[PDB]
Scaffold this motif. Structure first.
Motif, PDB file in Angstrom:
ATOM      1  N   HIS A  56     -21.521  -7.512  27.231  1.00 18.76           N
ATOM      2  CA  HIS A  56     -21.962  -6.940  28.404  1.00 18.76           C
ATOM      3  C   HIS A  56     -21.003  -7.565  29.525  1.00 18.76           C
ATOM      4  CE1 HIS A  56     -25.495  -5.358  26.351  1.00 18.76           C
ATOM      5  NE2 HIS A  56     -25.622  -6.543  25.674  1.00 18.76           N
ATOM      6  N   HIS A  75     -20.933  -6.720  20.316  1.00 19.51           N
ATOM      7  CA  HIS A  75     -20.589  -6.056  21.408  1.00 19.51           C
ATOM      8  C   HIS A  75     -20.706  -6.912  22.620  1.00 19.51           C
ATOM      9  CE1 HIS A  75     -24.876  -5.698  21.191  1.00 19.51           C
ATOM     10  NE2 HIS A  75     -24.979  -6.010  22.418  1.00 19.51           N
ATOM     11  N   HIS A  92     -22.204 -10.622  22.610  1.00 22.69           N
ATOM     12  CA  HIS A  92     -23.218 -10.347  21.713  1.00 22.69           C
ATOM     13  C   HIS A  92     -23.264 -10.305  20.346  1.00 22.69           C
ATOM     14  CE1 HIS A  92     -28.007  -9.235  21.657  1.00 22.69           C
ATOM     15  NE2 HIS A  92     -27.546 -10.236  20.893  1.00 22.69           N
TER      16      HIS A  92
HETATM   17 CU   LIG Z   1     -26.191  -7.150  23.789  1.00 23.81          CU
END
Ligand SMILES: [Cu+2]
Ligand SMILES: [Cu+2]
Lengths: 620, 620
Positions: free
Chosen positions: A425, A423, A584
Motif C-alpha cells: 500500500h 502486496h 503486506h
Molecule cells: Cu494490505
C-alpha cells in the motif's frame, strides 16, 4: 469570502448549468471528475475567480473532454478534446462497475467457466478492477475493466472468503461487450465462511469492556469559521476536500507572537497505489490507483459519532458531483476534534526545587474511504509543539485467492485453501512548501560517523552533514535509516534569532519502497513509488505523481517527466513528494477482517522558532 | 501467594535484619543495590523461596560484597567479597552525589578556577556524573565522580542555562578528596536564563485550551489482584519493579479460548546509555548508564493524577531500600490504565450490506524517572489485537555547554553563547521469550525482490525469506530498513490450525545505533549498543547487556561475553536483546525545556492465533 472555502452544492449545480448552456453536457455526457481549482499564485488581484475543473466522459463512445469553468463569471474558460489512447483514460465511473457482473452473467464463456466449477452465476459477485496497461493492444483507447469472481452464498455472506481462482474476464464498459475470458484451470473455492458478525465464528461477545467517556464540557478549543477555516492553539489552516485526493490541507500556518508564519501551502495524499506481488496471470496485472483510478474521495464514508469518531466531534459534509453534475453531499464525511496526547514536557529539578509538567494535545482531521474490500483511514495531526503528522490506517478485508497446494512464495494461507497475495500500500504525500514564505530549499541530512584520532582521540565524536538539493535532476532521493537520514525544508532568506535559516525536518518511517522489478509496467506507471523523496519546482499543472490520467496509461508521466525540466529549486517555490507505504505479507490474524495497521510521516520544526513554542501552555 | 508479587516493606526490613544478624550490615555498610530475585526455572517445587540480591558498599574503604539472602528462611544464601578493580564499581550512592560539590567548594584549585571566571562558589552547582574508564590508572579500583559546573543565580534559577565550560574536576567520594581539577580555558558563561515558569519568558499563558475530560463511569476494565497481577481483555501478567530496571513485566500471556498462552516470560529495559559526541576533553568522557550506574528505578517520580496520568488511574507504590536497608515507598510511582486507541477494524461491504466498525484499546503501564537534567518516561502497551509495545519518552532540560565562537560540528547553539552537545539515548530491551512455552527460535525475515523473467514475466512478484539463527555466534544482527527486515520469535513445536509454527514478529524503528568509533571506550563498555538485535540462550546470571557492575568497568562483559559461549538457540529457552535509541542533535525548540521525543518497538502476533483474536469485541 475565503477563496479556499469548500465547494457548495450551488457551485456544483452552477458548473452543471454552465456546461449545459455551453453544450458540453448533453444526455450522453457524464462527469468522471469535478473539483475546484486552487487560487493561482499571487492573489494580488482581489475578488477570486472560483474555477472548477471537469473531465467529461461520453457514453456514446465520443472523445472525452477536459473543461475548466469559471463559476464566478458563468463561463467556460477552456474545453479540450482528449485523446485517451495517448494521455490515458478517465477515472472509472461508478455506473461502469455494475455492468461488468451483469454483462458477464450472460456470456457463454463466463457461464462455461462457472459451470465447470459448479457455481451458480446468481451467487457470483464480480469485483471490477482497473485493467492497467499490458500486452493487449486491443485495449488501446478502450475503457476496459478486469473482473475477478467471488462466491456469495447468501445476501449477507462475505464473498471474499470464497475466491474463484484461475478465472478472469475483461469487459469494455462502453461498447458493453466481454472482450476476453481467461480460464487457467479450476481451483478449489475456499469453503470456510468469513462472516465476522456470525456468532458461530465470533463466539460469545466480550462483556469485559467498561466504557471510556471522553467529553469536553466547555466545547472544543478550536474554532471553525468560513465553514472550513480552522484556528487551533496558534495553528491556522483551511480544510479542503477533493473527490480524487480526499481531505486537503491549505495554508498551514502558525501564529508566532503577532505574526502568522506559513509552513505548508498545500498538503495532500496525491496518490495511492496497491501493487500485488503474485506472479499468477490471474492477478499479476493487479494494481489499484485508488486515488487516481477510483477517486477515494467519492467513496468517503459517513462517519458515525461514538463509533468512528469518539469525543467532541465537529463534522464537515463536503459536496461532490454525481455522474450527471448534480451535487451530492457526503454527510459527516470529515471528523475534526482535539485529543489529549500524554506528556508534552516534564522536568523535576533538584537544584531549583521546581517540578514542572505539561500535557500535550493534537488537532485531528480525518476521513475514511472504502474501495471494494479495503477501507483506508486518512488522518492529519497538528501538535502543540509545531509538529505536523500524517497517518494512514489500513483495514477492511484482505483481497483473497486460492492457496496453491504445495505452498507459495508470493501468497499467504489464511484459512484452509484460502490465500492472500502479497502486496504493498504505497502513498505519495504532495507537500507544497511555504516555510515562512515560498523561497524554500531542501537539504538532505545524514548523521556522520567520525574516525578515532587527531581531534577525536577518544573516538566518541559523531556529527551530521547537510547537502542542498539545487536542481530537480539531483532531487530524487532514497532513504538511509542506518545514517538517520532526514530532509530539512528551509527558507534561506528567513533566519531565527541565532542567525540560522528557519526550517522543518521531515521524518520518514523508512519502510520499503516499490519492490517490483525496475522494468515492470507498474514500476513505470508508479515510478514515484520507487524513491522516498522527490522535490520539484512548483507548477500549476503538476498535481499528481502519476499525471492527470492514470487509468490505463502507458507510464512515465508525472514526477519522472516533471523532474526532466531540471529546474532550480535552491531558494524557490518548491514541492516535496514523499513516498511511504506498507508492505503486506498477510497473517492469519488479518482474517476474516483485518486489524488496523498504520504508516505515515511527520515534520518537526528545526530552528523554526527562537525557543520552545509551548512555554505559554498552562499547568492545566 | 504469587512468587512474582512486589517486594513489601517487610521483606526489605527482613533483608536488613538478616544481613545485620549475619554481621554483613554494620554501621559502615551501605546498600548500593537491593532487588528481589525471580523464581528459578522450574517451579516444580511448591512453596517459593523469596530471595533478595544485595550489593553492600563499605564507606570505610573495605571491599564491597554481593550477597544473596533468603527472606523465607531468614538466611544468607551466599556472600562474596568483590574486587571492584576487576569486575567494576558498585552503583553510585545518592549520598555520594552531595559530597562532590561540597568537597570542591573548599579546594583551592576549584576556587582558583571559579575566581578566574568571577563566579561565586556559593552559586556554583556541580553535576556529579560517572567517571567511566579512561587513561587515569589512578582511578583503578577507586569510586571517582567527575563534576561539571553550572551557575544558579538564585534558588529557583535553572543552572543548566549557565554552563561553565573549560572546567572539570575528579573526586574520590570514599577517601573524600579531590583527585584532579582540569581547566582548559575560560569560556563565557551563557547569560540568558532558562526559567520556563518565568512570566517574562513564557509571556501571557494561553487561555485558549478547553478541558478534555476522560472518565470511566463503571471503573476500569482491568482487574488487579495479588497486588500486582493484571488481567485485561484476555491479557495476563504481573507488574514487577526493580530499583535498577524500573518497571518489569512478568509472565505476559494471552487467554486464547480456554487456555492461557504465554508469550513473554520477562520484559524489561535492561540498560540505557547516553553517549555524548562532543570531542572536547571537558565532556568526551561523558556517558551515562542511567540504568546501570545510577539506577533509574530509585529516581522514579511520584506521578500526579490529572497531570502525569490522566483518566481513571490505578497506582502501584513500589517499595525499595534506602542506603541503610530501610524500606522507602515510591508513592504512586507506577500508573496503570486503559485508553481508547481509535479504530481497531472496519469494513463497509457493498455486497453483503454489512457495515462494521470496532474501536481499539490499549492497557498502559508506566513510570517516569529523573536523572539530573533528564526525565525519561517508560511506557508498556498491550493492545486488544495481541500487539505488545514499548515506548520511551525523553524530555527534561538538555545538557549544556558553551557554544564555541566559530561554530561546532558536534554542538548545537540554543541561545547566545549556549551550546548543547550532540548525543544519543540508547536502550536495550531484554525480552525473555516464551512463545507458547520456552522452546523458541528466532528467524530474521527480509523482503526479497525478484527479477523479471521466467516465472515472473511481468516483473511484479516479490517475496520474503527467513533465516533461523541457530547458534549465538550467528545471533548478533543489524537492521536493514530497506529490505523491511524484522525478526520472528516462534515455537517450532507449537503450530496453529494451518500447521504453521506460532510466532511473534518484532518491528524495530531502525534508528541509528551507537555512532562512536568501534575502538572507543564507550563502544566496548556499551558493545550491545553497536547492534540492533542479540539472541542468547537463557542463563540465570546473564541479566544486563553490560554486566552486573557497569560503573567504572573496563568493558567487553555482558552480551559480547555471553555470546562467546556459542550456545544452541534453535528451539531452546532464549532471550532477545533489542537495541534502540534516539540520536539527538538539539534544536532551538528544545530550549529552555524540551518537548517530548519518543522511540521504541513492538511485537505483533504472526500466525500465533488461528484467525483474528478480536472477533468477539462488541459494537460498543
Ligand atoms: Cu494490505
Ligand atoms: Cu537528548
Amino acid at each position: 469570502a475565503s477563496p479556499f472555502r469548500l465547494a457548495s452544492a450551488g457551485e456544483i449545480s452552477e458548473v452543471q448549468g454552465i456546461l449545459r448552456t455551453a453544450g458540453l453536457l448533453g444526455p450522453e455526457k457524464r462527469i468522471a471528475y469535478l473539483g475546484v481549482l486552487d487560487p493561482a499564485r499571487g492573489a494580488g488581484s482581489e475578488a477570486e475567480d472560483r474555477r472548477f475543473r471537469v473531465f467529461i466522459h461520453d457514453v456514446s463512445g465520443a472523445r472525452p473532454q477536459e473543461v475548466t469553468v469559471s463559476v464566478t463569471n458563468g463561463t467556460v474558460i477552456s474545453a479540450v478534446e482528449l485523446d485517451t489512447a495517448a494521455t490515458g483514460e478517465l477515472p472509472v465511473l461508478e455506473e461502469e462497475f455494475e455492468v461488468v457482473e451483469q454483462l458477464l452473467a450472460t456470456d457463454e464463456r463466463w457461464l462455461k467457466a462457472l459451470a465447470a466449477r459448479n457455481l451458480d452465476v446468481s451467487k457470483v459477485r464480480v469485483a471490477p478492477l482497473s485493467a492497467g496497461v499490458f500486452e493487449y493492444a486491443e485495449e488501446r483507447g478502450r475503457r476496459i475493466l478486469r473482473g475477478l469472481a467471488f462466491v456469495q452464498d447468501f445476501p449477507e455472506d462475505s464473498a471474499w472468503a470464497h475466491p474463484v481462482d484461475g478465472l478472469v474476464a475483461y469487459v469494455d464498459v462502453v461498447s458493453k461487450e466481454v472482450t476476453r475470458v481467461i480460464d487457467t484451470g479450476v481451483f478449489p473455492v475456499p469453503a470456510e465462511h468469513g462472516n465476522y458478525t456470525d456468532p458461530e465464528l465470533t463466539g460469545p461477545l466480550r462483556t469485559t469492556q467498561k466504557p471510556i467517556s471522553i467529553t469536553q464540557p466547555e466545547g472544543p478549543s478550536f474554532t471553525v469559521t468560513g465553514g472550513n477555516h480552522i484556528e487551533w492553539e496558534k495553528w491556522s489552516l483551511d480544510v479542503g476536500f477533493d473527490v480524487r485526493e480526499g481531505v486537503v490541507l491549505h495554508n498551514i500556518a502558525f501564529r508566532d507572537g503577532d505574526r502568522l508564519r506559513p509552513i505548508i501551502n498545500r498538503a495532500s495524499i496525491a496518490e495511492m497505489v496497491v501493487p500485488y506481488g503474485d506472479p499468477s496471470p490471474i492477478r499479476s496485472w493487479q494494481n489499484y490507483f485508488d486515488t487516481g483510478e477510483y477517486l477515494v474521495g467519492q467513496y468517503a464514508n459517513s462517519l458515525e459519532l461514538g463509533c468512528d469518531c469518539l469525543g467532541d466531534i465537529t463534522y464537515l459534509s463536503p459536496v461532490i458531483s454525481d455522474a450527471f453534475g448534480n451535487p451530492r453531499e457526503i454527510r459527516n464525511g470529515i471528523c475534526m476534534h482535539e485529543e489529549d496526547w500524554g506528556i508534552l514536557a516534564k522536568h523535576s529539578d533538584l537544584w531549583s526545587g521546581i517540578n514542572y509538567t505539561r500535557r500535550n494535545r493534537r488537532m485531528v482531521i480525518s476521513f475514511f474511504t472504502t474501495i471494494g474490500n479495503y477501507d483506508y483511514g486518512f488522518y492529519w495531526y497538528l501538535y502543540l509543539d509545531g509538529t505536523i503528522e500524517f497517518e494512514a490506517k489500513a483495514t477492511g478485508v484482505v483481497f483473497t485467492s486460492a492457496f496453491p497446494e504445495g505452498g507459495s512464495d508470493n501468497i499467504s494461507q489464511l484459512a484452509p485453501g484460502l490465500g492472500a497475495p502479497f502486496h504493498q500500500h504505497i502513498f505519495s504525500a504532495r507537500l507544497d512548501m511555504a516555510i515562512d514564505g515560498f523561497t524554500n530549499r531542501v537539504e538532505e541530512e545524514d548523521v556522520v560517523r567520525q574516525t578515532m584520532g587527531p581531534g577525536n582521540e577518544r573516538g566518541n565524536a559523531f556529527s551530521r552533514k547537510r547537502t542542498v538539493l539545487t536542481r530537480e535532476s539531483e532531487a530524487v532521493r532514497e532513504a538511509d535509516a542506518r545514517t538517520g537520514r532526514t530532509w530539512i525544508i528551509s527558507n534561506p532568506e528567513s533566519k531565527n534569532r541565532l542567525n540560522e535559516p528557519v526550517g522543518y525536518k521531515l521524518h520518514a518511517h523508512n519502510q520499503p519502497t516499490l519492490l517490483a522489478d525496475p522494468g515492470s509496467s507498474i514500476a513505470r506507471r508508479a515510478a514515484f513509488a520507487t524513491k522516498d523523496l522527490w522535490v520539484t519546482r512548483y507548477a500549476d499543472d503538476e498535481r499528481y505523481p502519476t499525471g492527470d490520467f492514470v487509468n490505463q496509461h502507458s507510464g512515465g508521466a508525472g514526477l519522472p517527466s516533471y523532474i526532466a525540466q531540471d529546474r532550480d529549486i535552491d531558494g524557490q517555490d518548491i514541492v516535496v513528494w514523499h513516498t511511504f507505504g506498507l508492505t503486506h505479507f498477510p497473517r492469519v490474524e488479518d482474517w476474516p477482517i483485518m486489524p488496523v495497521d498504520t504508516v505515515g510521516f511527520k515534520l518537526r520544526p528545526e530552528g523554526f522558532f527562537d525557543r520552545s513554542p509551548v512555554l505559554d501552555v498552562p499547568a492545566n
